[PDB]
Amino acid sequence: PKSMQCKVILLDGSEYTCDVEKRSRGQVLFDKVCEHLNLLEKDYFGLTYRDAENQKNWLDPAKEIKKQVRSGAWHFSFNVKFYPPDPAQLSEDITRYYLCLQLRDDIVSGRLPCSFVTLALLGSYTVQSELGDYDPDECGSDYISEFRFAPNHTKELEDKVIELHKSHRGMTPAEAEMHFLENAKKLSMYGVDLHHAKDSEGVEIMLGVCASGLLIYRDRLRINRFAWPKVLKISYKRNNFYIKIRPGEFEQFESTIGFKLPNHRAAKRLWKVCVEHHTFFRLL
Ligand SMILES: CNS(=O)(=O)Cc1cc(C)on1
């Protein structure tokens, strides 16, 4: 029984290595990584790989790993797939922990834009969670944390992290992680998966996929939103993505909105993440 070596980048930046039978479904590898992480609330997470075009794809747990990675290396990342709008209601602290680690990467990467004050406040909770109570002995007037807090670090930002860290004396790691999440969950790009696209007129837009629905970013004043309940049918054909928008009261017909994606693979990927978000965040 032939086994393939799998390498998974964990959210703390370390590498987990295991073996699975070469005909294994994605669920097999996912279960091994989740057991390694002592993670029970597995439903919010998944594994990503890079396709032949270097695009991030979700590893489908129902399908063979080899028929997804195809010609590519068996290298993956462990990531949050469904960002909970209500992190307080997750049953375990360790779930909230992995969600914080993902969000810290969302912030440092620039995928999750954040004001100066929120960067400093999120930083201060991470520092409290990881070092515990503020200690002056560690930090002088010229202190710069090992912690990456932001896409661009400034001395002013480091100073504000410390000032807020001082206010958190006695806060437990679980408590600081919950505060991190209560702030992060409010950011306008929290849990928004962005896809480049063109509207039916050729104008360049972003489509955002998240808990509350499909978002269409056209300009800083032209932002459309389709709550999942208002979405009957999601389809793709060639380079095109389509959503069937439910008839308004007393309207005779559904409305159809069409987008142009860069290529057929980009259209399919957007369709799949939409269907998965629609299913997941249909109901409670
Ligand atoms: C605490 N989790 S949440 O995403 O905020 C709500 C939710 C969705 C599903 C499924 O289970 N719970």
Measure 77 CA to ligand 1 centroid, in angstroms. Answer: 22
The CA distance from 241 to 256, in Å, is 10
Q: Is 221 in the pocket of ligand 1 (CB under 6 A)?
A: no
Question: 175: Cβ–Cβ under 8 A, 6 or more apart, which residues?
Answer: none
Q: Are 173 and 129 in contact (CB under 8 A)?
A: yes
Strand-strand pairing, 75-80 and 3-9:
parallel
The CA distance from 248 to 161, in Å, is 48
Q: Is 212 in the pocket of ligand 1 (CB under 6 A)?
A: no
Q: Is 279 in the pocket of ligand 1 (CB under 6 A)?
A: no
The CA distance from 82 to 27, in Å, is 17
The token pair that represents 268 in the structure block: 């399919």
The CA distance from 35 to 135, in Å, is 35
Query: What is the atom index within ligand 1 of the atom nearest the CA of 82?
Result: 4
Which of 45, 90, 99 should be mutated for ligand 1, with most atoms under 8 A from CB? 90
Q: Which of 132, 166, 130, 163 is nearest to 148 (CA)?
A: 130
Phi, psi of 241 (to 5 degrees): -120, 135
Give every strand in the sheet of 56-58, ordered side by side: 15-21, 3-9, 75-80, 45-50, 56-58
- Which residue, chain included where needed, has tokens 């998966």? 193
Q: Which of 229, 220, 217 is nearest to 281 (CA)?
A: 229
Q: Are 46 and 11 in contact (CB under 8 A)?
A: no
- Which residue, chain included where needed, has tokens 């995928």? 111
The CA distance from 220 to 197, in Å, is 16
Tell me how many degrees the CA angle 47-51-55 measures, rounded to the nearest 5.
Answer: 85
Beta partners for 195?
207
The CA distance from 84 to 280, in Å, is 10
- Cα dihedral 97, 88, 278, 208 sign: negative
How many angstroms from the chain centroid is the CA of residue 181? 13
CB neighbours of residue 4 within 10 Å: 17
Which residue lies with its CA nearest to atom 3 of ligand 1?
84
Query: What is the atom index within ligand 1 of the atom nearest the CA of 280?
Result: 10
Which residue lies with its CA nearest to atom 12 of ligand 1?
284
Q: Is 94 in the pocket of ligand 1 (CB under 6 A)?
A: no
- Three-class SS state of 107: helix
Elucidation technique: X-ray
- Which residue, chain included where needed, has tokens 């997941």? 280
Q: Is 283 in the pocket of ligand 1 (CB under 6 A)?
A: no
Q: Is 92 in the pocket of ligand 1 (CB under 6 A)?
A: no
